[PDB]
Amino acid sequence: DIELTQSPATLSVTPGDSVSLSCRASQSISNSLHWYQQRSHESPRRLIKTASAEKAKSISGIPSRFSVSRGNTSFTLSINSVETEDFGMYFCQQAYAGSKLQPHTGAGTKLEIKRADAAPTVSIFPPSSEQLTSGGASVVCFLNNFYPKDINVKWKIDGSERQNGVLNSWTDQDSKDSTYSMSSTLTLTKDEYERHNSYTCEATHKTSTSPIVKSFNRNEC
Amino acid sequence: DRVRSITLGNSTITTQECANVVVGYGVWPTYLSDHEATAVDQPTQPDVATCRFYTLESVKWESSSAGWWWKFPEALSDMGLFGQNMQYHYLGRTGYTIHVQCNASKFHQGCLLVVCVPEAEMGAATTDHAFNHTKLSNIGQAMEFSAKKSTDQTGPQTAVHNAGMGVAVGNLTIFPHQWINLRTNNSATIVMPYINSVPMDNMYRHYNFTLMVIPFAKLEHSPQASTYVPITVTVAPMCAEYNGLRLAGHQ
Amino acid sequence: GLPTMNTPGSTQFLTSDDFQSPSAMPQFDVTPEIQIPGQVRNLMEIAEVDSVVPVNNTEGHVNSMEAYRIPVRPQTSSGEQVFGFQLQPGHDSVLKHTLLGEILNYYANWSGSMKLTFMYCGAAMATGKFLIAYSPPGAGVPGSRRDAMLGTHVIWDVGLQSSCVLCVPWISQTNYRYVTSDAYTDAGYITCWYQTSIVTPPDIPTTSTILCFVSACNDFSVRLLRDTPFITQQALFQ
Amino acid sequence: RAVGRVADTVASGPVNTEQIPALTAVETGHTSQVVPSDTMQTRHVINYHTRSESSIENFMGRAACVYIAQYATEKVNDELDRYTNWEITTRQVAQLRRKLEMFTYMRFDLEITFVITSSQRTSTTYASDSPPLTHQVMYVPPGGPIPKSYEDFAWQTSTNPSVFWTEGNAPPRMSIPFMSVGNAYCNFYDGWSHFSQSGVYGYTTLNNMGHLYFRHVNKSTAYPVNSVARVYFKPKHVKAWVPRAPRLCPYLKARNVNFNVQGVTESRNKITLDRS
Amino acid sequence: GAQVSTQKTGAHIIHYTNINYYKDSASNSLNRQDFTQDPSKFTEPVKDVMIKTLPAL
Amino acid sequence: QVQLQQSGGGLVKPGGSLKLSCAASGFTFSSYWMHWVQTPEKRLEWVATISSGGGDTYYGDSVKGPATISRDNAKNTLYLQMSSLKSEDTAMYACTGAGGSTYYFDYWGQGTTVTVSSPAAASMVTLGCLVKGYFPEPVTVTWNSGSLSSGVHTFPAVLQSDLYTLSSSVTVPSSTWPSETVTCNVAHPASSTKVDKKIVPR
């Protein structure tokens, strides 16, 4: 109340192929329901509006690729056809019976470009003398070339795992070869850095049953 | 027969082709009796000055036209001594003689519905917003309907299959109506009396009825025929009397 | 005092009772009534004036003005079918949101005869006739014009007068028929056929229009008042 | 004969004349009065049916719920307060509103019956002995002293009419005369409020009807109890004028007459019929 | 002060006696037995009368 | 259209008096406002400057027509650190600003501090500098003095009590590394501080 279990289901689509979003409502279902896509630039990108059975109002940017219909108690959105660049995150929003106000915005799902599944490749490098005098230790490891986000990452420092002060990030799609990557930033003390000799980076994939081991020499100069 | 000859004041109307004159709910318009009045002032009664035929502006009937509506007594607010005595008063009590006319040919086709709906409270175009008073009716302009849903902001709902009042447009025949079928008919004439729940009412804060002209069967013709067929509405007040003299309005 | 006895049916709230009740504002002076035109004393006075029906209600034409326009064209072989529907004036998709339908949905039974008035809307120079049959439900809906000429029918000739009235009779074994009709109180089927053709002089468009009306005769009745299954709500309007 | 009984069907036979009972002209706005004898050969049938159920008194004269008031014995927020008002109008429920909107100007003496139930609120314990509660329903005329909260000076009803109902008895009931300012209740008022054609539009301006304040008479209970008051209206002595066409699209707001745009009817497959 | 009127019976001992108790006209019961009607204001609201056997135009 | 451009961004302190201004091309009023913290957006206010049901006590006056000043976020309570949007509602095509966020976390400037990583390796050479512990999330990362701004992976920073961490991975072949000169440059919006650091060769 007002429960919207939007928006199953999208994972994942091919450029040029179809998917059918849906959204459900449980309050006063004969409202002025519509959709609202989103991408992390903001970038509003409104896409559709329907009230109440007829009068579908597609936008001028995409006027001949979407289709909404209802019902009853749920309403869908078919896409023919998707093309990169595209959103992103799709929200199912409502109103009262006038009404181009867009309240009642529920949760939503995502959809992107199609790639082959690829394992994350991590690599670790010797640091500089900029973290030595400050008492900390920022060990650097930049992952590369994975898809999708059904992976795992860990920080096994010579047999000692560290969950204290670790940093995790996920980038969006880079536009040279459609890659994804993560980062690592560690915050150690002084007496805990030189207790080891060579820090070890691991990362797993749903396809590969073993992580990748990479070794760097700290005392090498 | 077909021939009618209406005369009021000093302006007459002659029609060679007519169906009949539907008169209201079965009553001729008349003055207020002495046992129905609530005011105490002596009312004024201009019989030749107001009770005459005023011709409104012309509209164009094309193929993809949806309809038109006038709201009375707002559509006569700037016409002659009817609209001058309206400003210098507080109460008004008139009946009307609406005479809509449209001649095309024996080769055209089409059908209108000339209805007069009392208290046509129109729904708004968008909900939860009060709308402008100039989008219901102007002083002389014929506000038009639409074929699709009106997604306006400060106007009424102009869906022609809902008639603005949320009712289905087919059931408008309870109100005094006549059809202008261009096969036989040429002009529709209605005599509608003063219909209100009070004996006399103000004429600016209350549109009494709403003359609606809606094409049901759309107009088709050959492209070689004449493509401009207008619809002119001449309305005449009847048995008008005014009360409560005052300075010039209207606010 | 006088010895009374409470019968069964005491301290109850029957919804449709007519009992006296103490007034809250005593000796109130009401406002005197006046001659206001258009008084109704019976709901059958509203259900006796005609109203057009959406015969062309195929999707999507219900949310547009083309629901009432019956397409009539110059045929190439006589005896075709112009339209057709079942005669359920409270449950069919045609005759239930009309004026006769929206009154009869407030009641449960009906009786009497109706009037289907058909009004031509073509050019003044176009001619032609039609056959408007009404078959009581003995052997189903008729197939062709020969199979429908056996039933009750009128042959309307389009001329100077623009409109004819097919008056359906009251043929039923029951004195009343239900609005949400079951198989025990079937009413019949209404068809309408091309009698000869629609012929025209040149420079006239092909498509014409026929508007159908519906009404009730002077012996219509209803019974067993209910609430209509047409408006729904979830909460109170605020 | 009697009044209200329907007309008969006089017998007829085969005719061949210049009369045209079938043909007519709807351009006059004149519905045809065609008796079934004027088309086919009918028999003499006596009709004993009556139009009693379709009169305006039997159509409007039934009780219908209007407003469902909620009020408890312990205030927890501003919707379950100790008291509860109601701006009295017949437009908040859907089924009574569509009956009253079928005519433009009506004139009826009202008749109001309350049914008042109660239920203990959910808590951790329920065992308590309490005497039967007394509900007070005070009519406030338009332009009177409203009670601002509980225990106010204006709950005494020195001129207002009120009821006092013990739970478990017959429901309260009282009749109200026709108390408009004009000569009829305007169920449709196409016009504005001020003379400048601005402000509030619709029939909201003419709904000056008063209020109806519900409260408990008892000071408190042991554990808080919610009460529900359902208000039923029954218009008697009804005189209706200028019949409207019955509204198709469902309602949205209790003040104005706004609507979604709806189709005329339900759809079907085609225009013909395809069985023998 | 008693008023005796007929009862709504069928079609082919039948009376009822009501007594008005309260001193208001609005406090009386319903009069459900006014079946009178006149549909000539909606079906035939014309100035020139149209007879069925006569032509219309 | 053309919405808006709302500016953006707001600022500390939550003592009160935050304003959000936008522009337009028509549009006589149908403007709204919407804000979200980490969820889908909320909804206040309506098709006016009039209030909404359920929203907090901040209800901003917005002038008519095409300026709509302002949001009027008076008396902030640090719950309202979010990103505001503003729809226009005159089809076609009902697009928003979509404004800018306002959290901004008093008070100090915190000029940039970096810890550059030196790779030491295979057929590819990946390189990135750890700008660590800075307050203002706006920055401008420039690699190879304005030539290598294509393969930069801009990463989301993580807040742990007024410290952020951006890192920009750039990838070069071994034709430049380790012979030529490589240095990441950060143009700093809030404090205008310049950093310059060289990767040490092995």
Ligand SMILES: CCCCCCCCCCCCC/C=C/[C@H](O)[C@H](N)CO
């Ligand atoms: C609480 C003691 C009993 C008094 C009951 C309350 C008296 C008020 C009864 C209402 C009278 C009807 C007023 C008109 C009702 C509707 O608003 C009209 N149909 C619209 O104008």
